[PDB]
Amino acid sequence: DNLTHCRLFEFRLCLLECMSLTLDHCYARCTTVITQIHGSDTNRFDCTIFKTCYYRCYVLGKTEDHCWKGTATSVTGDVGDLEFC
Amino acid sequence: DNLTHCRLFEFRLCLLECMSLTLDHCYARCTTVITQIHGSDTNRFDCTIFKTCYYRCYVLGKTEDHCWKGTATSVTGDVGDLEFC
Ligand code: NA
Ligand code: NA
Ligand SMILES: [Zn+2]
Ligand SMILES: [Zn+2]
């Protein structure tokens, strides 16, 4: 897949666990840990686009589950995906 | 300032230098280096919003200088800033 380098399921599971523990700065801290484990490829801009689409949806609303499933099906990390995700 | 933790001028100067050297994956590699130097606070979502606004503008067009000046004046890192930046 074109986004395999982004480790996005790993990011998802990190954010869910971090929020379950009620920790501060989960987006930042998960991003950082995944960088430490899997390197700079997880911070490319296409990864950023997917994450922003997913996290805006998960911030501005609820059901993390539809936020993930919808982003995963319709977002390829193109900058244009922000217009609809 | 509310975005001082994001080290965004540092990011800007990194991206400009990296692109001047014609290197691969400058967005990713600058993000990663700034994380290594200044920690997880540089990866908060408000930082992500500012960077995405700036970099989309700098990708979809040119004059990096107006992309920076406009984002810096009108983007506070609110998720809603994506609608207009
Ligand atoms: Na990112
Ligand atoms: Na980021
Ligand atoms: Zn892993
Ligand atoms: Zn520094």
Residue numbers in the entry:
A (entry chain A), B (entry chain A): 5 to 89
The authors write:
The Mu8.1 conotoxin from Conus mucronatus is the founding member of the newly identified saposin-like conotoxin class of conotoxins and has been shown to target Cav2.3, a voltage-gated calcium channel. Two recently published crystal structures of C. mucronatus Mu8.1 revealed an all-helical molecule forming a homodimer, with a common dimer interface observed in two different crystal conditions. Each protomer in the dimer comprises five disulfide bonds connecting the four α-helices and shows structural similarity to saposin-like proteins as well as con-ikot-ikot from C. striatus. Five disulfide bonds contribute to the overall rigidity of the toxin by forming both interdomain and intradomain connections, referred to by the roman numerals I–V. The first domain is stabilized by two disulfide bonds formed by Cys18–Cys34 (I) and Cys22–Cys30 (II), both connecting α1 and α2.
Here, we present a high-resolution crystal structure of Mu8.1 obtained from a new crystal condition in the high-symmetry space group I4222 at 1.67 Å resolution. The structure reveals a dimer interface equivalent to that previously observed in Mu8.1; however, in the present crystal structure it is formed between two symmetry-related molecules. The high-resolution structure of Mu8.1 obtained in this work allowed us to identify a tightly coordinated hydrogen-bond network around Lys55. The network of water molecules revealed at 1.67 Å resolution surrounds a potential functional residue, Lys55, and may contribute to the unusually low pK a value (8.16) predicted for Lys55 by PROPKA. The relatively low side-chain pK a could imply that Lys55 is uncharged in the dimer, thus rationalizing how it can be accommodated at the hydrophobic dimer interface. Overall, we propose that the combination of this side-chain stacking and the observed hydrogen-bonding network creates a hydrophobic microenvironment surrounding Lys55 that results in a lowering of the pK a of its ɛ-amino group.
